[PDB]
Write a protein that binds this DNA or RNA. Structure first.
Ligand SMILES: O=c1ccn([C@H]2C[C@H](O)[C@@H](COP(=O)(O)NP(=O)(O)OP(=O)(O)O)O2)c(=O)[nH]1
Ligand SMILES: [Cl-]
Ligand SMILES: [Cl-]
Ligand SMILES: [Mg+2]
Ligand code: NA
Ligand code: NA
Length: 307
DNA sequence: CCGACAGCGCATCAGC
DNA sequence: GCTGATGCGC
DNA sequence: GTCGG
């Protein structure tokens, strides 16, 4: 909020690079710069000042100078009024429509949500669902609803087989007051490093909790769910992970992104699967893990895992 | 100067 | 029909 | 776009 003008500018630049220019690394550069500035506890008076922050270089410092002196960015104002670029950028807000699809659509005169509605045959299954729940997917989920959603998931999972273990991770596990989606990690003692995932998904569809499917395989389900009453439709992912790699998965999918990076950087090598020792760099076999604390013993409650 | 910049499952396409 | 590449979300 | 070897 203290430098919201600058961070919004950088975020807008970020999106354009990712969505229109298809330059993912420049997207991430702008985001990294936006993040380090948003955490900066002073009102920025110059680009030179911001330049001192890691992730802010010459080009962004120059842009900040323009923004501070004029209250805007010339090229950013031009991009906003550009029909092609703004349409491409907007279409990517539809889940399933990335930079490639967005560009192709705009190339053939398809630029709006209404245009998408008139051209259903040109959309794949995922994109049709993204279109259908466009507004709902951009809503956040209050913790109270997440709790009700957790109630349903844990209940139905245990009814299928009481030996399943299910954990809602992500921001919810970190105790966030709101969440963007629901991330569920699933395991079963019969699965280590059968159709375990299918049976869970089917039961959730049976009680009319899961309403649509974006993608589904033996280890990962991505779909849509809805609380009964009208509640917005929500995004839910369910991952089946081997029992012996469960808690590494729980750690990884709990977050936050900043905490995860800082944890393995201050670590051994830690990925989503295992933790293995490193010698000349030759990684050994995975270490035995039966809890989150074991990783730390090689502690931070989820409540404080922002960094 | 110049390469890194995370890594994975699934859906779908390109090539054969 | 197949294998591998690409797009996509996250 | 920025960083760092
Ligand atoms: O690009 C990504 C994003 C997330 N992840 C993992 C790490 C993260 O902790 C986990 C949860 O992703 P969310 O984007 O769902 N993080 P959070 O769930 O904590 O934010 P929200 O409440 O917005 O989902 O998925 C990746 O591996 N790659
Ligand atoms: Cl790039
Ligand atoms: Cl591994
Ligand atoms: Mg989440
Ligand atoms: Na800097
Ligand atoms: Na999209």
């Amino acid at each position: 909020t203290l430098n919201g003008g600058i961070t919004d500018m950088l975020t807008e630049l970020a999106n354009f690079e990712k969505n229109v220019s298809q330059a993912i690394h420049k997207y991430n550069a702008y985001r990294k710069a936006a993040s380090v500035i948003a955490k900066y506890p002073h009102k920025i008076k110059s680009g030179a000042e911001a330049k001192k922050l890691p992730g802010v270089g010459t080009k962004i410092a120059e842009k900040i100078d323009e923004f501070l002196a004029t209250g805007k960015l010339r090229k950013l104002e031009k991009i906003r009024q550009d029909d092609t670029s703004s349409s491409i950028n907007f279409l990517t807000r539809v889940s399933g429509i990335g930079p490639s699809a967005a560009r192709k659509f705009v190339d053939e005169g398809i630029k709006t949500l209404e245009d998408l509605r008139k051209n259903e045959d040109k959309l794949n299954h995922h994109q049709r669902i993204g279109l259908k729940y466009f507004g709902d997917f951009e809503k956040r989920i209050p913790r109270e609803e997440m709790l009700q959603m957790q109630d349903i998931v844990l209940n139905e999972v245990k009814k299928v087989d009481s030996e399943y273990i299910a954990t809602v991770c992500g921001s919810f596990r970190r105790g966030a007051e709101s969440s963007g989606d629901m991330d569920v990690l699933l395991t079963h003692p019969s699965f280590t490093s059968p159709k375990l995932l299918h049976q869970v998904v089917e039961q959730l569809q049976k009680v009319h909790f899961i309403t649509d499917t974006l993608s589904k395989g033996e280890t990962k389900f991505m779909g849509v769910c809805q609380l009964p009453s009208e509640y917005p439709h929500r995004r839910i992912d369910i991952r089946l992970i081997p029992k012996d790699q469960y808690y590494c998965g729980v750690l990884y999918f709990t977050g936050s992104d900043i905490f995860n990076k800082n944890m393995r950087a201050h670590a051994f090598t830690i990925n989503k699967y295992t933790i293995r020792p490193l010698v000349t760099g030759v990684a050994g076999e995975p270490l035995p893990v039966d809890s989150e604390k074991d990783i730390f013993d090689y502690y931070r409650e989820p409540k404080d895992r922002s960094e």
